Amino acid sequence: RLDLAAYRELEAFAQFGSDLDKATQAKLARGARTVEVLKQDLHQPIPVEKQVLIIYALTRGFLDDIPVEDVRRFEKEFYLFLDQNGQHLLEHIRTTKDLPNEDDLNKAIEAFKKTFV
Amino acid sequence: APEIVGEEHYQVARKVQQTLQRYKELQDIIAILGMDELSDEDKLVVHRARRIQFFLSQNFHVAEQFTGQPGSYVPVKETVRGFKEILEGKYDHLPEDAFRLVGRIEEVVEKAKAMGV
């Protein structure tokens, strides 16, 4: 929520990117990616655990290496990777309604990035 | 309603609407600040929005007493083709007035030729 609000109040400065300080450039870069990840296709629901995991990936900085045009595809491939080998994380979220262990989560996200292109 | 059009036609139709939405927002900016500041980035949007908007007009068979012309009948394939060309920039060089009150895009090319392009 914080990132989205800051981006909305910064929108008018985006036209002038070459001139901004690095803090504002960071805020704009985060806002563009947040807006990308909040997109969705009609009639395609997502499970809550997958929603939480992708939002965690966004807000923890893992997604700010990808170009804003790869964010949707990254999300899709990440879901497939989770289906294949993040079953312990998915099960832990389903059962405890809580975030999994941060170190294991970070390892999973970095491992997926090691195979993204 | 995405399916039928969905592969070819839906992508062209939504890209036309996105271009015309941006041009509305630009029109109040455009007047004062905008024609200099927009002239680099956003004039690429405005230059195509002017042409897309002129090409959406047509000459009708029953409107001859109003237009001095006979009418035209455009099949959907040719429509979708022509708008895809204009969005790809194959016609950015032709004058914007050639696009007015024609049928097929070949007719735009012919009218610009007659104008002396």
Binding site: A12, F13, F16, D19, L20 | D28, I29, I32, L33, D36
Partner: protein
């Protein structure tokens, strides 16, 4: 009607946000520009000291640039911006130049125009003013390396004889609110500030050979300070 008022409100809000961003970024660019002017100061001081010494302290009117000659035609150097949305910044300088040359020139061949930035260039293409040299973007940083060539050309035009007096018209910065139009005579160097101090001066070339390389660089440096 109510709908028209709603549309006007939205239009006015959109433009206000854009002018507010354009204000803040100009505020940043002003701060960087002032620092950039302060950066240049030691070199501007050293060359002026040495020039005073060599020309006035040690010698006399032996170089063409130091010697007044009867004026066969004068050139006007005017610095204006490349885009609008500044209040009177360009119109002030263009007004002063137009009025002065109108009040002290009768026929077109008496003068030439060397201009910087699109706005002044257009102001002179309107009418039929005889503009001899131009440049535009000077991407305000122009790394300064880009403006070296326009400065050498103007000095060389004076040198070859096409000018007898050369002037500079530009806005001078006082503060955020006060920018004062300013005219300075760029050539000849008819008035040089004195200082007494000097060090052991050398003579690998003569006095004349020293001046032949010194004076053009001093003029180019005055242009860059303006």
């Amino acid at each position: 009607s109510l709908r028209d008022i709603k549309t006007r409100i939205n239009a006015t809000k959109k433009t206000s946000q854009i002018t507010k961003a354009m204000e803040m970024v100009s505020t940043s660019k002003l701060n960087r520009a002032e620092q950039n002017a302060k950066s240049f100061v030691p070199y501007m001081e050293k060359i002026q000291e040495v020039v005073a010494n060599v020309a006035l302290g040690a010698g006399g009117a032996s170089h063409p640039m130091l010697v007044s000659r009867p004026v066969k035609k004068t050139g006007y150097l005017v610095i204006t911006s490349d885009r609008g949305l500044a209040g009177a910044y360009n119109s002030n300088v263009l007004r002063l130049v137009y009025q002065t040359i109108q009040k002290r020139h009768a026929c077109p061949d008496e003068y030439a125009i060397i201009v910087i930035g699109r706005v002044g260039l257009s102001f002179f293409r309107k009418r039929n003013m005889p503009v001899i040299l131009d440049i535009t973007r000077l991407p305000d940083q122009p790394s300064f390396a880009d403006i070296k060539e326009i400065a050498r050309k103007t000095v060389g035009l004076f040198a070859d004889g096409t000018f007898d007096e050369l002037y500079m018209y530009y806005n001078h910065y006082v503060s955020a609110i006060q920018q004062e139009v300013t005219e300075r005579k760029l050539l000849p160097l008819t008035d040089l500030a004195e200082n007494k101090q000097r060090t052991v001066y050398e003579f690998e070339p003569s006095q004349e050979e020293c001046l032949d390389v010194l004076l053009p660089q001093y003029a180019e440096s005055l242009i860059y300070g303006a």
